[PDB]
Amino acid sequence: NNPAIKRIGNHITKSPEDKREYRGLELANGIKVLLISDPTTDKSSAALDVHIGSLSDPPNIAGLSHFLQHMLFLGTKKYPKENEYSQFLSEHAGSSNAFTSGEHTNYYFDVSHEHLEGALDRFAQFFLSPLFDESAKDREVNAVDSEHEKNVMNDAWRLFQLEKATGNPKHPFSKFGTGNKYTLETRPNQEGIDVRQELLKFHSAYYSSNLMAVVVLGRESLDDLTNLVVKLFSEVENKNVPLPEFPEHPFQEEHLKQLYKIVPIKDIRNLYVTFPIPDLQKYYKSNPGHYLGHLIGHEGPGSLLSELKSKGWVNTLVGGQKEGARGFMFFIINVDLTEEGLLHVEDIILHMFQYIQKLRAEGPQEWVFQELKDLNAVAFRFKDKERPRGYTSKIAGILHYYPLEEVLTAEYLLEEFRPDLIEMVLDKLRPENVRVAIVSKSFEGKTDRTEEWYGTQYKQEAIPDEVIKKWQNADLNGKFKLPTKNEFIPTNFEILPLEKEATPYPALIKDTAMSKLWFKQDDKFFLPKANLNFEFFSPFAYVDPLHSNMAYLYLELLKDSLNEYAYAAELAGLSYDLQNTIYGMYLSVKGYNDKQPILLKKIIEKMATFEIDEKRFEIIKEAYMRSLNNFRAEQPHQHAMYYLRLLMTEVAWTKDELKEALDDVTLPRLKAFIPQLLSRLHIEALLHGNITKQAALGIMQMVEDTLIEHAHTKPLLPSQLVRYREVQLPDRGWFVYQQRNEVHNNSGIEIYYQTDMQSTSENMFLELFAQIISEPAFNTLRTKEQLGYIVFSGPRRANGIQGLRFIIQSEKPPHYLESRVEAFLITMEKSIEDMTEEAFQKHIQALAIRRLDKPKKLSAESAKYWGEIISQQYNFDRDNTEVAYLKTLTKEDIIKFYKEMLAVDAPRRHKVSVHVLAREMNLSQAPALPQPEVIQNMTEFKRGLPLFPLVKPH
Ligand SMILES: CNC(=O)[C@H](Cc1c[nH]cn1)NC(=O)CN(CCCc1ccccc1)CC(=O)O
Ligand SMILES: [Zn+2]
Secondary structure: OOOEEEEEEOOOOOOOOOOOEEEEEOOOOOEEEEEEEOOOOOEEEEEEEEEHHHHHHOOOOHHHHHHHHHOOOOOEOOOOOOOOHHHHOOOOOOOEEEEOOOEEEEOOOOOOEEEEHHHHHHHHHHHHOOOOHHHOOOOOOOHHHHHHHHHHOOOHHHHHHHHHHHOOOOHHHHOOOOOOOHHHHHHHHHHOOHHHHHHHHHHHHHHHHHHHHEEEEEEEOOHHHHHHHHHHOOOOOOOOOOOOOOOOOOHHHHHHOEEEEOOOOOOOOOEEEEEEEEOOOOHHHOOOHHHHHHHOOOOOOOOOOHHHHOOOOOEEEEEEEEEOOOOEEEEEEEEEOHHHHOOOOOHHHHHHHHHHHHHHOOOOOHHHHHHHHHHHHHHHHHHOOOOOOHOOOOOOOHOOOOOHHHHHOOOOOOOOOOOHHHHHHHHHHHOOOOOOOOOHHHOOOOOOEEEOOOOOOOEEEEEOHHHHHHOOOOOOOOOOOOOOOOOOOOOOOOOOOOOOOOOOOOOEEEEOOOOOEEEEEEEOOOOOOOEEEEEOOOOOOOOOOHHHHHHHHHHHOOOOOHHHHHHHHHHHOOEEEHHHHHHHEEEEEEEEEHHHHHHHHHHHHHOOOOOHHHHHHHHHHHHHHHOOOOOOOOOOHHHHHHHHHHHHEEOOHHHHHHHHHHHHOHHHHHHHHHOOOOEEEEEEEEEOOOOOOOHHHHHHHHHHHHHHHHOOOOOOOOOHHHOOEEEEEOOOEEEEEEEEOOOOOEEEEEEEEEEEEEEEHHHHHHHHHHHHHHHHHHHHHHOOOOOOOOOEEEEEEOEEEEEEEEEEEEOOOOHHHEEEEEHOOOOHHHHHHHHOOOHHHHHHHHHHHHOOEEEEHHHHHHHHHHHHHHHOOOOOOHHHHHHHHHHHHOHHHHHHHHHHHHOOOOOOEEEEEEEEEOOOOOOOOOOOOEEEEEEHHHHHHHHOOEOOOOOOOO
């Protein structure tokens, strides 16, 4: 035996397709541990989840655990450099993050497989000897203030806290998880709190070993990982902390039968119906709430959503069980509202209860349970291999809930059929404990309350008793039926033998005027799945704002019309994705290959013989108007990025231009557009997965054939296959475009240093430079200078051209952000000069590892190929080519590069900046900048400049 280990679990049940190896165990200090050994893996990973979270904040210091989560990254006793951790990761091809829910704090990272031990050692120190440096705390508190500022004007975050503020304020549920500058500094200072103590106190009280789960994944054997984990983690001290419980629901009697009217930020209409329920988590083997979710949330014929959608009152619905914390859960049903639907909220809920009643009337249904259990068993067997960071983070979390042996299956497999639990949860979905929330702009001015944290305007009301009764006496309604056998359930899982002529990259197997078929049968993953991707080209999908609107509308109407039929396939692991592009349309069909050709044929056939329902047209149109308008409520950085897309692309229709042109969109006009669009096309497809050359040609040909038979599609001409170019910027020039965000009181900035076209050479100069500056940018602009929560840098790539970019969202003005990036950029040339050839070579090696990391799942491989095909570079072997070339570069290559294209006095510096100002408008040396040329009109700017070439295909 071994003193450090309390036990090794028995065999960990995995899918029989999972080649990875697993060992579970419990340390002597009580920490639950999963070990994953994957000798193939390119990146390694570890995560730790602690069963404590914002629900355990001192009442008097809101968001202390979320703050503590930020601080652990910023220095321990053993590795005291503020950024040892994030720099060690950067230089060895890793990344990291954390999050805090009300009951968990979850920390994970990935790294190159050679450096797991180094990564992990630095990591353990978080849980033993964090420094909470006084100077780090002062600074990092602003990052948290930004995190919340971001969220303040977000409609989902406000609704989330508003729920917490209307249950029992005495309950921990009512707490503010995020914290801000106010709750973390201003106010604790006023009240003579030393926050460094309070962080040391909270860390020491709750970061106890008995409350921790670790997962590690690496190339090492299971024995090697064991020794490793034991070594680094046995010294975490066990304080035997009792795990927090919340037996009492935060919605007590007086919180039930309430109605709330709420004003949103975006122009949206929504109804949130919600009942309290007990903790259902222990019933995971039978899962009563999933069963009722499957049903109430169903979207097929017969379903609740269906009648709500035919009465033209709602558009979408979600319902099912919602997590609470240990002790309570909720059951929700929320829908959005047509303008008509808003005036029928009473009737909508009554339909809701008529449906619930139908379920009571029919009793539990084993055949539905069998169906659910079967889908999940299939889902489990053929689960795609996950990226290791996500996987460890996830499993660390759930080690807290399941026996070691079941950690892999517990969330998937079903075992027990429980008509009793089903009937019991069903007894709680009653008018006597309902909550109703309506979110609409029409409550503007009519509100009397304000939510402290986010500022939400709202009104609370008792639901009239006769209203409750009307709901209590819900009749059956003959429009509601249980769903019938799901015919889309796959049964054929045969993995076709690997062909004689199969290749490692996709092959151009068809090159006609109508279509260009790229194909690869799967040589890696061997699951009964495929992806079938299609670009359809029409110059009419974007010839003008009007047309762009129509392509959009057409596609939403089609998706809406297929929804009832398609929902079945989606439960059966077969889904599709269909949207309009600036080039025509896109279509992806993904999942188990068995019934895949059925659904595809149904889609094309529909596309080509489409009949629009006047009622449905009118609603989607209204919903689209709002959507375009709602862009004004998007975040300042998302705005900045948007403007820069509009400014650098040859052709691009502005949200305003679409909004305006959307009124000339009549039903007559739409009916005429469809056959026009569908009459001349080109198709470029990539077919990839468990399929053969001959089946692939058949599928492609069936698509074409359907379009001819029904829309008379003829091929498009080679010269009409027009791709849009990027604006070419003048050597030494600098432009600024300035706009205002009228909703958020932060500002946004995008700075673009354009370089040259994409070419093996020019590609890797940019990438290495980005790699070297990646963490220092984060570390300088955020950690040190605390300019904002959002601080991004990296390559930008569009229409075959490229360049470096910075994105910041900040409280300080853009002219200010400009200058500190510039400051930073000098710091950088200064660093490349001072760095060891070996430091230089580490960065080369990290980019190397990132670039070469093998896809772990089909979808991921497809994506890499598709990027090659949509960009028309067709460079399928690019990763080996570009990497070979990378290893050839030297410090002087990169300085020359920075001196030519990037330094402030660079002979070919091409700088464009988007400044997005807020609602309302020591440190390194910043260089003196030129008078920028302020862009007045986006069209003029474009007319007056060269356009770039397009990239030659490989
Ligand atoms: C398993 N149950 C079901 O089948 C249905 C499916 C459905 C589709 N359309 C309609 N209903 N239920 C659901 O999907 C929804 N609920 C709640 C979401 C709670 C949430 C809120 C914000 C942020 C993170 C999660 C469960 C879930 O997410 O699985
Ligand atoms: Zn955070």
